[PDB]
Paper text:
AcrIF4 is a 100-residue protein from the JBD5 phage composed of a helical domain and a β-strand domain. AcrIF4 is clamped between the spiral backbone of the Csy complex and Cas8f. The β-strand domain of AcrIF4 fits against helix α1 of Cas8fHB. In the middle, D20 and P21 of AcrIF4 engage R299 and R302 of the helix α1 of Cas8fHB by a salt bridge and a hydrogen bond, respectively. On one side, F54 of AcrIF4 forms a cation-pi stacking interaction with R293 of Cas8fHB; on the other side, L39 of AcrIF4 forms hydrophobic interactions with L300 and L325 of Cas8fHB. The helical domain of AcrIF4 interacts with Cas8fmid through a network of contacts including three salt bridges (AcrIF4-D8:Cas8fmid-K216, AcrIF4-D89:Cas8fmid-R210, and AcrIF4-R97:Cas8f-D213) and extensive hydrogen bonds. Target DNA binding to the Csy complex induces a 180° rotation of Cas8fHB, which is essential for recruitment of the Cas2/3 nuclease for cleavage of the substrate. These interactions observed between AcrIF4 and Cas8fHB indicate that AcrIF4 may prevent the rotation of Cas8fHB, thereby locking the Csy complex in an inactive state. Structural comparison between the Csy-AcrF4 and Csy-target dsDNA suggest that AcrF4 does not compete with PAM recognition or hybridization between crRNA and the target strand of dsDNA. Consistent with this observation, electromobility shift assays (EMSAs) showed that the Csy complex was able to bind to dsDNA substrate in the presence of AcrIF4.
The Csy complex is composed of four Cas proteins including Cas5f, Cas6f, Cas7f and Cas8f in a stoichiometry of 1:1:6:1, and a 60-nt crRNA that integrates all these protein subunits. Consistent with previously reported structures, the Csy complex adopts a helically twisted ‘G’ shape with Cas5f, Cas6f, Cas7f and Cas8f protein components integrated by the crRNA. Target DNA binding and R-loop formation induce conformational changes in the Csy complex, enabling it to recruit the Cas2/3 nuclease for degradation of the invading MGEs. Here, we report the cryo-EM structures of three type I-F Acr proteins, AcrIF4, AcrIF7 and AcrIF14, bound to the type I-F CRISPR–Cas surveillance complex (the Csy complex) from Pseudomonas aeruginosa.
Numbering used by the authors:
A (entry chain J): 3 to 100
B (entry chain B): 3 to 224, 239 to 322
C (entry chain A): 8 to 434
D (entry chain I): 24 to 358
E (entry chain H): 24 to 252, 258 to 358
């Protein structure tokens, strides 16, 4: 009975929302820390013609870039989803305990 | 403590099963107490014959590989273990989890004494390296470099320079030699001033909480992560007393019955992995001991850092 | 604080244990109710508790996490604080001690009896100090209450001579003059329990899950949250964690170690930059560290400079970190092979190949050795600056103001340091 | 009264490293310094159930419905390449020396008596039976554990590495030297005298042991498997992880050491196994049975107590076993 | 009493490699050592819905709205090139020997009894029926699993490799040698006596098995398939290094297809030697434990209480000991 937004609570640390001048381009942080400077192994990707940036469309608002990031994570990368699932289950058991 | 007259460099030593468990709260690179105890064992085993005093170690860590694994569906890591022998009845023993890590460190040893004059520099450098080849550095064997391209030799750099330009020149010559790693220093003034900042934020703060605050990656609302100055690891910076000092032949089951035993407990401080050309003087960044045994507080740090 | 209500509380607790055993007993014959109400219903249960206090012990630093066939001495000792600034551990617990218990798991009824908060405090601390309500509620005789007090107060006293086993750790520490101390360290279960509770509260707490919702909604929140990456789980009891301690049943093993890791703990490999010409933008800039560094500069270069010192120091140390990772990239690239620019091509960055491969001089003794020692190839810093000025945004408000001049000043300063390092490559 | 030391700890002499396995072709073993490493990759397996049913789940409906739901594992697999029939397994061995001196000893009386006992052994019979068997377990590639069981030809090369180079080089046919006979040979006696001079002296002797095994094109090599408790949730679980140091398959150092210690042909049970590894209460992890029990007087603790404490020296075989344990290391001591 | 052991780990005899698949033209099968390997590549597929509807999706608006938005995917496909009609599948197979010896066993008396039992088997009858059927499964290219079913002409070339070179070379027609009858041939018997000498420990046997299958120009080949972690990637194929391949346990499962002795009908032919002899395709376990003919009841009667089974059933038991496995209870 663990809902989807409680899994998104721990899945959102795997995304990174970089600011560009047009808008907000989401990405994927493989180390799960939101693209930190030192502990952050961000996933950079190779595109069509010399594209080395974040996997993610340049969205107008952060609310939609984060939503497209969460939708990509739910569609394709289910190992990070299983990580966030077990995190949400341990959080629910923690609030059942403390 | 006292300044090094020379600076000996043990080159890239390969350690195969070093203790990844630094302390009860920290894992990863082994504690600087391991390296300071290794250099005191080097003093105790070869330094009392060359009439020198090997004191102070600078830790560099060119390569690090922990024998860890990330379990499926888990964010954290566990340790890959070894299969111990059985009991006398044939059952599997109870597993005691030890962390093993493959290091490649190079040590800068502070050498001072009258044996610098009596012997050549390459002779005492060769002697401490041939003694270090039979030793172990955090519980792990020092791999002695057979049949690669060339063996990495030593260099005992006399810190006494005839000019400041020549001194900066051979500090650069040594820093280029120990470059692909990251020197490990102690930033406890940064830990205390971060505790002071956290106490102006919220009163009744402990510096365990300030240490944790320097460890985490904090997410901040407008979202952005809070940046950090450097790498800023937690290290065990010594021991603190739990018992009064017991007499040599008084405590039970000690290592030797000629040394006073005292039950101690870790003292977690802050470290900082920085590159060796950010220090601009390699005679700093050397880890010494500080005992003050009447109070407890057996600890190591690198004083004279900043 | 009246002895009658404390008498009511102790008889109520033993009657709750009576109804607990008669609920989880499932007896229908053999007359277990008689011995059950003869043992755990009268005041002889307190005599059995005065027997069972010797098996348990309130501990703060136990030895059982070090190899569990080690029969040493465990301590309920609180260390004094260091006067020296910075470091600390396990004496920071002032009121937040959890007071671990080792011993028999079937004997923990005495500890559940001592953990009651009946009037305003524990019955333990009520038994420490001399009080009239103490030593009278739990008895009708005086000397029996004295020996019951001397039994019940012994749960915080170490039993036996001080001992650390052969399986326990003990480690010489050199004194400033010629001496050693043995220094047997113990495992702090109260400090591990406090750090474990802090980590579980910061990761799974309600005030952290709320800010976790607020970042996933991309909204705003009052406070933030924390992550603690790269944790490692170390379990103490293998399949039976109850035999280590009491608190190792709350955390089933699970030491939750923090990462003290060097920055080169994910060292991927070195690949010689063959089929490109601008190595700062193709093989160096493709590294996962300097991409985050340049993106953090791109965030930090287009903003208000009213906080001049804080933003200026941050940009200076970031440019220092980028030239630092450049020097580490050139340094770790020397393990490839002594000749890889000798591999024939046409466009392979022939000015940066004087920098990233100095061991062609060992092969070409006069051909290529004398062309990097007289030239001293250090114009690479200018190309590094032309690459690093792609981090600044193409904004005329950033160009016209003094931010561009200050940025160029400290950028040229760190490039002076990096170029001066590349100048003396030949010693 | 000369009680036993409450803390005894001997360091590990004969300290090997991780046996790096690489791959190439036989009859260019002499140029095997740029042979590419055997890499550990993942493959997917799907298997049916084969374990024993527990006499309540033997009914055909549950069994037939349980072969319709198979276990699906990602295992680590190390193979030779399809153009390479020879496996080169290479490690380094440090023979440290100071073999009877304990790293920790409480009693100075017990320490002096144990050093007197070890020196009485070494003068009476040096490290010449032990190091002969250590040189055998180097010479026959017992450290090739499952990499030896079907090889067409195993060949072990051992190089005494002095200050910068090979001081003295050996080369053995590891299949002629059996896994159960500690015979005599001139080159084995030279290697044994070198391991003896290492175990006696104050400094270490470094050897470089390289063993080539002609398995076959593309065949499986068997590096060490990692003891990983808590593999995780069963979906992305890797059911077998093979050990590899740096993108290069390897055998653990304690596995190589366990093969080197297999010298014990002195245990009282019959030698259907032959040599076992030198352990206190000599216990084979593959057999699940501990020979040298303390119900007999033939384990390491009873023999060391009789030899050092009350001077009941055992036979020469059991004191070989005792000194082999002191070379093996261990943490001994009562409460 | 002589109860069975709690650990019993038999090493796998008959070790195959990953069967690498190359691709060229027939009639130059003899110069097929520079043949370019079959590469696994990606193509996007798109299918309408074709599975059974669960009595709720038979609403016509729901059915048409699921058909209007069909699932896109991206499978891994491996084809022959359009100018190459032959698939060369090449592995090596090492026959080890020492079949009854376990690699791990708690009980010593049970290990001795098991070794005496297998020794009486081999002395009464060697690995001559078993190696005949293993040589058949090398000779008829059953390790070509779906690469065999529509092939015009399959040809297997089996080379025994001594020292470093070919000692004795066979060459079979894998379509004349059927998939279900174990007949007798001179070259099959020579291969069987070689696999016998390998399985008895009386020699070192390393075979190299090359099988050419004449499929057609540009046709699809079927390497082994991995489990998968719009672009859904519904199929991932095996490959070692940009070269398609069959898993070694698939080759070994085709080599163990010798069990013609199961209690059901012989219309299916041989199945693989597995305890509780099970086929994953047909979803059925022959040699159920309720009839007394699975591997464990036959072994625990042959070894413990000395009830020697039928000759074909002890062929099956020693085929399981050659097969490997983790036997023994908790």
């Amino acid at each position: 009975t663990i809902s989807k937004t409680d899994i998104d609570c721990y899945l959102q640390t795997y995304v990174v929302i970089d600011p560009v001048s047009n808008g907000w381009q989401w990405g994927i942080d493989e180390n799960g820390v939101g693209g930190a400077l030192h502990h952050g192994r961000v996933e950079m990707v190779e595109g069509e013609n010399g594209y080395f940036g974040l996997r993610g469309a340049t969205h107008p608002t952060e609310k939609e870039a984060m939503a497209a990031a969460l939708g990509y994570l739910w569609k394709c990368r289910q190992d990070l989803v299983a990580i966030a699932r077990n995190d949400a289950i341990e959080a629910e058991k923690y609030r059942a305990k403390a | 403590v006292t300044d090094p007259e020379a600076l000996l460099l043990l080159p890239r030593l390969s350690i195969q099963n070093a203790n990844a468990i630094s302390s009860p709260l920290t894992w990863g690179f082994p504690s600087p107490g391991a390296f300071t105890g290794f250099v005191h064992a080097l003093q105790r085993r070869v330094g009392i014959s060359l009439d020198i005093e090997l004191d102070g170690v600078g830790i560099v860590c060119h390569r690090f590989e922990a024998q860890i694994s990330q379990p499926a569906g888990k964010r954290t890591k566990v340790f890959n273990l070894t299969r111990n022998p059985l009991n006398r009845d044939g059952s599997t023993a109870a597993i005691v989890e030890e962390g093993r890590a493959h290091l490649e460190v190079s040590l800068l040893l502070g050498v001072h004494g009258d044996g610098l004059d009596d012997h050549p520099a390459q002779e005492i450098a060769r002697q401490v390296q041939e003694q270090a080849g039979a030793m172990r550095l955090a519980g792990g064997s020092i791999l002695p470099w057979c049949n690669e391209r060339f063996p990495a030799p030593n260099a005992e750099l006399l810190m006494l320079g005839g000019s400041d330009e020549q001194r900066r020149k051979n500090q650069r010559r040594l820093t280029r030699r120990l470059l692909p790693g990251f020197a490990l220093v102690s930033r406890e003034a940064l830990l205390q001033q971060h505790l002071e900042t956290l106490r102006t934020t919220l009163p009744e703060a402990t510096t365990l909480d300030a240490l944790l605050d320097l460890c985490r990656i904090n997410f901040e609302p407008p979202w952005q992560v809070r940046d950090k100055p450097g790498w800023l690891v937690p290290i065990p910076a010594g021991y603190n007393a739990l018992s009064p000092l017991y007499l040599p032949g008084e405590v039970r089951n000690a290592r030797d019955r000629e040394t006073p035993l005292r039950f101690v407990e870790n003292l977690f401080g802050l470290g900082e992995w920085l590159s060796p050309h950010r220090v601009a003087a390699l005679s700093d960044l050397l880890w010494y001991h500080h005992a003050e045994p009447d109070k407890g507080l057996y600890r190591w740090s690198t004083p004279r850092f900043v | 604080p009246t002895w009658q209500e404390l008498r009511q509380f102790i008889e109520s607790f033993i009657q709750e244990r009576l109804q607990g055993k008669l609920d989880k007993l499932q007896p229908d014959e053999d007359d277990k109710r008689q011995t059950l109400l003869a043992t755990h219903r009268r005041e002889a249960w307190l005599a059995d508790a005065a027997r069972r206090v010797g098996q348990l012990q309130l501990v703060t630093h136990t030895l059982k996490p070090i190899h569990p066939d080690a029969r040493g001495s465990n301590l309920h000792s609180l260390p004094q604080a260091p006067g020296q600034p910075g470091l600390a551990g396990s004496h920071e617990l002032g009121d937040r001690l959890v007071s671990d218990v080792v011993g028999n798991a079937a004997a923990l009824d005495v500890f559940k009896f001592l953990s009651l908060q009946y009037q305003g405090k524990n019955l333990l601390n009520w038994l420490t100090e001399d009080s009239a309500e103490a030593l009278q509620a739990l008895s009708d005789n005086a000397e029996q209450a004295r020996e019951w007090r001397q039994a019940f107060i012994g749960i915080t006293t170490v039993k036996g001579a001080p001992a650390s086993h052969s399986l326990a750790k003990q480690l010489y520490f050199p004194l400033p003059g010629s001496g050693y101390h043995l220094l047997a360290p113990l495992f702090p279960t109260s400090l591990v329990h406090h750090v474990h509770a802090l980590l579980r509260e910061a990761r799974f707490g309600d005030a952290a899950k709320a800010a976790r919702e607020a970042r996933s909604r991309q909204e705003s929140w009052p406070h933030g949250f924390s992550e603690y990456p790269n944790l490692a789980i170390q379990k103490f009891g293998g399949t039976k964690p109850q035999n280590i301690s009491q608190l190792n049943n709350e955390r089933r093993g699970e030491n939750w170690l923090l990462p003290s890791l060097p920055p080169n703990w994910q060292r991927q490999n070195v690949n010689a930059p063959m089929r490109h010409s601008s190595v700062f933008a193709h093989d160096f800039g493709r590294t996962p560290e300097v991409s985050r560094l340049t993106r953090t500069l791109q965030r930090f270069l287009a903003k208000t400079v009213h906080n001049n010192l804080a933003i200026r120091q941050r940009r200076a140390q970031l440019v220092a970190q980028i030239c630092d990772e450049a020097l580490q990239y050139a340094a770790r690239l020397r393990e490839l092979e002594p000749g890889w620019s000798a591999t024939p091509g046409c466009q392979l960055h022939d000015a940066e190949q004087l920098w990233l491969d100095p061991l062609r001089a060992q092969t070409d003794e006069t051909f290529l050795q004398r062309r990097l020692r007289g030239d001293w190839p250090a114009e690479v810093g200018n190309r590094f600056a032309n690459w690093l000025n792609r981090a600044v945004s193409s904004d005329s408000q950033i160009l016209g103001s003094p931010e561009a001049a200050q940025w160029s000043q400290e950028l040229s300063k760190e490039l002076t340091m990096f170029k001066e390092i590349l100048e003396d490559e030949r010693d | 009264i000369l009680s036993t030391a409450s803390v005894l700890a001997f360091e590990r002499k004969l300290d090997p490293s991780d046996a790096l396995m690489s791959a190439g072709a036989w009859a260019q073993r002499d140029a095997s310094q740029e042979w590419p490493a055997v890499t550990v990759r993942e493959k997917s397996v799907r298997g049916t159930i084969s374990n024993r049913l527990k006499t309540k789940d033997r009914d055909p409906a549950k069994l037939d419905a349980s072969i319709q739901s198979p276990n699906l594992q990602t295992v680590d697999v190390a193979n030779l390449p399809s153009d390479a029939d020879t496996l080169k397994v290479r490690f380094t061995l440090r023979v440290l020396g100071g073999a009877g001196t304990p790293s920790a000893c409480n009693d100075a009386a017990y320490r002096d008596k144990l050093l007197q006992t070890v020196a009485t052994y070494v003068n009476d019979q040096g490290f010449a039976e032990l190091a002969r068997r250590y040189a055998h377990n180097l010479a026959n590639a017992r450290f090739l554990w499952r990499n030896r069981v079907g090889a067409e030809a195993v060949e072990v090369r051992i190089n005494h590495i002095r200050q910068g180079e090979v001081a003295r080089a050996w080369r053995f046919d590891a299949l002629a030297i059996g896994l159960r006979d500690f015979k005599a040979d001139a080159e084995l006696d030279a290697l044994a005298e070198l391991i003896a001079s290492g175990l006696s002296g104050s400094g270490h002797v470094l050897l470089e042991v390289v063993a080539f095994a002609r398995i076959g094109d593309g065949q499986e090599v068997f590096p060490s498997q990692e003891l990983i408790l808590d593999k995780g949730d069963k979906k992305g679980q890797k059911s077998k992880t093979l050990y590899s140091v740096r993108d290069a398959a390897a055998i653990h150092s304690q596995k190589i050491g366990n093969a080197l210690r297999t010298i014990d042909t002195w245990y009282p049970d019959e030698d259907g196994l032959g040599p076992i590894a030198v352990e206190p209460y000599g216990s084979v992890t593959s057999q699940g049975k501990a020979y040298r029990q303390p119900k007999q007087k033939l384990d390491f603790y009873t023999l060391l107590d009789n030899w050092v404490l009350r001077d009941e020296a055992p036979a020469v075989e059991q004191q070989h076993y005792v000194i082999a344990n002191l070379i093996r290391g261990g943490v001994f001591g009562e409460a």
